Amino acid sequence: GSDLGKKLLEAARAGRDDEVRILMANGADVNAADVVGWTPLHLAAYWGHLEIVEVLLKNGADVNAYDTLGSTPLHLAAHFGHLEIVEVLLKNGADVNAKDDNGITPLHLAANRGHLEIVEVLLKYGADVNAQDKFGKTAFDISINNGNEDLAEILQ
């Protein structure tokens, strides 16, 4: 596709908000994907760069882009405790029950790292509380296994 594709992946990767605007403006493919299938929105979501997430979404970035293992930007934001990104992704239409190749959902991941504020927002937006991964496990099983009583309360 584009040389600016790769520059945008790199700039989103490294949190360079200004370099990201300038590249958006010059036609850089907003859904350019690297070798593992990560888009700028994936990278910005994983590394916690909120402004870049926002700029990209406004420029039409595919909110539900999936990587080669089926994981979406919301999987990454939920897993790495980035609350304000989780909220924006879900507001711009992120699929709250997206499953990866393993059947893992953003809820499973937030639950596993005990990100409680994130777990609440996911349930706010309709996250399926009884979704099973390929092993039969729910967010509730994950709370029991990790002995995280606060998270057990929240999932009843």
Partner: protein, 578 residues
């Protein structure tokens, strides 16, 4: 001084005889071909520890001696138990006395004695140990390990044993080399190269707690936290320290043979000044023993004395310096469990620091008069040698020359001590430097009964040892630092003889078998510290010339007395008497 090279090694949960016969003898037998060795001595202790001291002719290059020693030890390492090898054997070329002590307290009481010791172990000790001129560093405390405190009732409920716990920890706290995607040599046209990451070391009690021991036949899960309490705690619990009565830890530092005291102390201070800014709040360095304005006090209780009775005596020592001598004494740093020469429940040391010389005017407030008064004040403490000393009669080794054994060498020692007590005009204070035998719990495993039940001896001995002695399983990463993981019974299931009967082992047919079905036990005596001298069993005797009598006359009488001892008992002079 004759240079001395020291080998130290450890076997967790081993008694003196085990240490002596799987470690000490083996190293000793292989200290051949080393230049200028004058003599060799060792202790094998019921703390699971051995110290071998090789003393070289005066003028020997300590560098060369250390190297020659380390090289022989390396060639013997494969003959030692895996449990000892895996602790790390150390070889040092240093003074036996401390150059200085670095104390560490928490001024805001935010951190316990145990937290502080770990902070020191984990953040300060290694850089101090790498400083040039630093010969030996003793932590006055222990680094944390991950401690799995097993409950035998809960293990038996789920038909498990410590073997199953250990197996599961090695499998689930693992660091796995998994290769790569697009690894070399690759196929033509490969676009992606990435490391594969599988299992990594666990980092938290939470993680160890969810180790999966087994899935019951109804599909429920038995996690490690269901048979154990999981906590950070010391690799050992033997050494506890206080600064002016407050929780403390610290580093006792000994000068490398030939190093410059003053430059080494300065480099140590420079290194501590790199660390201070990153201490957690409260943590503070104090300087309780900088070598004339300082002295030590030794506390030796008889073998068999416990941590609490040593503590009681240390409290009396500390109290005296902080009440009676408060106009002269700035501080006391007291260590329970360490005693200058040796490490044990029955021993302690206090490091005393005086106020400015200028503010202690008068002969009666100088070191000599103070130590002398303190020795007098402590001379009437019951069943404890307590003495204060700044830092010569004779040093005698009674030697087992004919395989006589511990018991006969003890009788022979006692015969010589009794004979020397009948010459009070020639000899004074002729005494053992070591420890008396004490009661020990002899347990016999019935091999016939184990085989009849289908219980494996290795499961029996691993069960006994891991529970009652502790077992170092493998490593984990605590806040980025490699540290150890230990399994052991929780305290309350390993205190009394009846507790033996509550440990169960699983037979080949799945049945749980209590230890009482295949064992029997009795009380007996044995040694908490076995000594050797130039490779043979030995017993060190100290003493002095009586008043108005020469060292050489006293020695001559010791030789006379020694020539009438039972067949196969020899002797030799060492130390000051060589």
């Amino acid at each position: 001084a004759p240079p001395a090279v020291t080998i130290s090694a450890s076997y967790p949960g081993a008694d003196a005889k085990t240490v002596q016969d799987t470690v000490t003898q083996v190293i000793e037998q292989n200290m051949n071909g080393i230049d200028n060795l004058m003599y060799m001595s060792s202790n094998s202790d019921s703390t699971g520890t051995v110290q071998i001291t090789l003393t070289f002719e005066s003028g020997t290059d300590a560098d060369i001696a250390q190297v020659q020693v380390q090289n022989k030890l390396q060639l013997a390492m494969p003959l030692l138990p895996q449990e000892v090898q895996q602790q790390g054997v150390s070889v040092e070329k240093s003074s036996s006395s401390f150059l200085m002590v670095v104390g560490v307290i928490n001024t805001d009481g935010t951190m316990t004695q145990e937290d502080i010791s770990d902070y020191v172990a984990a953040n300060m000790k290694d850089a101090i140990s790498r400083t040039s001129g630093v010969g030996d560093v003793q932590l006055f405390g222990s680094q944390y390990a991950m401690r799995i405190w097993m409950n035998p009732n809960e293990l038996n409920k789920f038909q498990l044993t410590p073997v199953d716990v250990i197996t599961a920890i090695k499998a689930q706290n693992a660091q796995v080399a998994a290769g790569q995607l697009g690894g070399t040599p690759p196929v033509k046209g490969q676009q992606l190269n990435a490391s594969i990451i599988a299992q990594t070391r666990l980092t938290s009690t939470e993680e160890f707690g969810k180790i999966l021991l087994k899935v019951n036949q109804d599909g429920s899960r038995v996690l490690l936290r269901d048979v154990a309490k999981i906590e950070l705690g010391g690799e050992n619990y033997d050494i506890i320290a206080e600064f002016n009565g407050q929780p403390a830890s610290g580093l006792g530092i000994k000068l490398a043979t030939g190093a410059n005291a003053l430059d080494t102390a300065a480099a140590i201070r420079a290194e501590l000044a790199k660390m201070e800014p990153f201490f957690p709040s409260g943590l503070k360095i104090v300087y309780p023993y900088d070598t004339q304005g300082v002295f030590m006090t030794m506390v030796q209780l008889p073998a068999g004395a416990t941590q609490e009775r040593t503590q009681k005596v240390l409290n009396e020592v500390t109290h005296y310096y902080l009440t009676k001598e408060k106009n002269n004494v700035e501080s006391v740093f007291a260590v329970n469990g360490f005693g200058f020469a040796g490490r044990g429940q029955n021993t302690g040391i206090a490091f005393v620091s005086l106020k400015d010389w200028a503010d202690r005017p008068g002969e009666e407030n100088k070191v000599e008069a103070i130590t002398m008064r303190a020795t007098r004040a402590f001379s009437q403490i019951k069943d404890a040698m307590v003495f204060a000393f700044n830092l010569t009669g004779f040093d005698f080794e009674l030697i087992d020359q004919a395989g006589l054994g511990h018991e006969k060498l003890t009788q022979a020692r006692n015969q010589l001590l009794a004979e020397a007590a009948k010459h009070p005009d020639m000899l004074t204070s002729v005494r053992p430097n070591g420890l008396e035998d004490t009661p020990q719990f002899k347990i016999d495993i019935d091999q016939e009964k184990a085989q009849a039940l289908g219980v494996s001896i290795n499961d029996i001995n691993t069960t006994l040892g891991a529970a009652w002695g502790g077992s170092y399983v493998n490593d984990f990463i605590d806040r980025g630092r490699v540290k150890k993981v230990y399994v052991m019974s929780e305290a309350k299931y390993r205190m009394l003889p009846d507790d033996i009967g509550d440990w169960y082992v699983r037979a080949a047919d799945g049945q749980m078998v209590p230890f009482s079905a295949f064992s029997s036990s009795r009380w007996e005596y044995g040694s908490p510290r076995l000594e050797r001298y130039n490779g043979l069993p030995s017993m060190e005797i100290l003493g002095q010339a009586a008043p108005g009598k020469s060292t050489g006359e006293a020695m001559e009488l010791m030789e006379q007395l020694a020539s009438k001892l039972p067949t196969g008992v020899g002797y030799d002079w060492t130390g000051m008497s060589y």
